[PDB]
């Protein structure tokens, strides 16, 4: 019932920022496994027939949450990138909210990089919006996603080692610095 | 105060099970960073003058515990391996305790592999002994180590992706299966 999300670009199209090798493993093996696992774990449970978002919003810690969170996180992650983005910062309401909540986009980038690099272990740095329009940076452990806390996820950096280890090894910060160049802000803006 | 532990073998000596590349990054970069961080974080705190082990036993969750736990974990990890072990299973008191508590060494291996593969995200599978001589398998998240719970750690498998990603990518189970052939049971026995 859960299917792989189609990439809007070729597996090597994010080069030189993310290698084809990383996309091949990260999308083709890790995300495939999360989808496979979710399909294996939901039969016989009331989570069968639920969207990944509904599961992430409701399930306690466990294998189903872990895999549904990872399916949601990776879907949002791969689909927020483009080979050659038209713009390299957000405009519109998101641009305005970033100014309001972080002072400037440049300062948001600093804070978001810091959260990404500071997360100990596996997880995700997320920029989300709450139901009243305020932005939040969160460190989501392991497979967690801000939907659990009732936030709407906008931009997610995967800092599981598999996201970067083939390209950057231990140098997480060097990886995170490069991601800005491939963010499709048109997609991110429309998550508000 | 905190120094890198001397490796008892050359960086390529665990080949073909663990590559030189993995030792170069895992020991030379990851463990170096954890030791560096502990040296940066501990001066001027209640932890100054304490051994790594004492810190792991006493510190609450936070950056000091994360780094001290990882120093302890990795120290025990590297020192429990040898290029060409004389035997491939424990004898003596350890051998007897494994039979007692797990039925056989083969069943211990099955349970330990299962704990290793089942740990979601970053962490460690640990075999430890309690005050009564009973053995336990624990899944320690992130930088945790059984010393916190007053258990004495005997054998630890690192299932952070950096431990295996360069050699096995996503195939953690295939990595864990190979570790058994480089365990130095002479060292592990003397931990009991
Ligand atoms: Fe990932
Ligand atoms: Fe490690």
Author numbering:
A (entry chain B), B (entry chain A): 1 to 192
Question: Can you quote the paper on this entry?
Answer:
Here we studied metal-preference evolution within the natural diversity of the iron/manganese superoxide dismutase (SodFM) family of reactive oxygen species scavengers. To study this process, we leveraged the existence of naturally Fe-specific, Mn-specific and flexible Fe/Mn-cambialistic SodFM homologues, which differentially utilize these metals to catalyse the detoxification of superoxide. By combining phylogenetics, biochemistry and structural biology, we demonstrate that SodFM metal utilization can be evolutionarily fine tuned by sliding along a scale between perfect manganese and iron specificities.
More cambialistic outliers included the Bacteroides fragilis (aCR 0.98) and Coprobacter fastidiosus (aCR 0.99) SodFM2s, which seem to have evolved higher Mn activity from their most likely Fe-preferring ancestor. This confirmed that the presence of GD-2 and AD-2 within the context of otherwise predominantly Fe-preferring SodFMs can indicate potential evolutionary metal-preference modulation events. We identified at least two independent emergences of cambialism in this group, once from Fe-SodFM2 and a second time from Mn-SodFM1 ancestors. Next, we leveraged the cambialistic SODs from S. aureus and B. fragilis to investigate the specific role of the XD-2 position in determining metal preference. Importantly, consistent with previous reports, comparison of four protein crystal structures of the WT and mutant SodFMs we determined here indicated that metal-preference modulation by XD-2 and Q/H occurs without any significant changes to the secondary metal coordination sphere within the resolution limits of the solved structures.
